[PDB]
Each structure stands twice: as structure tokens, then as C-alpha cells.
Design a protein around this ligand. Structure first.
Ligand SMILES: *[C@@H]1O[C@H](CO)[C@@H](O)[C@H](O)[C@H]1NC(C)=O
Lengths: 45, 49
């Protein structure tokens, strides 16, 4: 302002950015086998 | 024929050559188990003023 004349200018600006990525997992595998022989029929148990 | 792992008695014949009382049994097993699990999560947030 100079002296009548008056001037005023105000500017405001804000920005915000956010990113969140999360991944959690588990996989399990297990195999077991057997084999046997027996050299009366009652013993088959 | 004598009683071997069976009934009281058994009768063979001339054409039959042999009878056996040897009990032999075998076995085999193949068991499997598994599990496959997946988990994907994603998130985003943006604010402007
Ligand atoms: C995951 O694996 C385990 C391993 O024994 C199993 O007991 C369970 O049933 C599985 N779950 C699934 C495939 O959803």
C-alpha cells in the first residue's frame, strides 16, 4: 500500500500422499510313508 | 495234509504236487500331505487440501 491504494494477496497450498502395503503368508508341506512285510493270517494285524 | 494255519485237516491228490503252510504277507503305503497359502494386502490413502 502506497499513499489511496491498498493491495493484499495471500496464497496457501498443501499436499499429502501416503502408501502402505503389507503381505504375509506361510505355506507348509510334509509327507510321510512306510512299507513293511510279514513272513497264520492272524499275524497280518 | 497236516493242519497248517488253517482248518483241522485237508486232503491232497495225486495230480497236486505240493501244499504249503508258509504264511507270508507284504504291504506298502504312500501317504502325502501339503498346504499352499497366499495372502496379499494393499492399501493407499491420499489427501489434498
Ligand atoms: C494347512 O496345512 C495343514 C498342515 O497339516 C493342514 O492340516 C490344514 O488343513 C491346511 N489348511 C488348508 C489347506 O486350508
Amino acid at each position: 500500500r502506497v499513499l489511496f491504494a491498498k493491495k493484499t494477496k495471500v496464497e496457501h497450498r498443501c499436499t499429502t500422499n501416503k502408501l502402505s502395503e503389507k503381505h504375509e503368508g506361510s505355506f507348509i508341506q510334509g509327507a510321510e510313508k512306510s512299507i513293511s512285510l510279514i513272513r497264520s493270517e492272524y499275524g497280518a494285524a | 495234509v497236516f493242519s497248517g494255519d488253517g482248518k483241522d485237516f485237508y486232503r491232497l491228490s495225486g495230480n497236486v504236487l505240493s501244499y504249503t503252510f508258509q504264511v507270508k504277507i507284504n504291504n506298502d503305503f504312500n501317504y502325502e500331505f501339503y498346504n499352499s497359502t497366499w495372502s496379499y494386502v494393499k492399501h493407499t490413502s491420499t489427501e489434498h487440501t
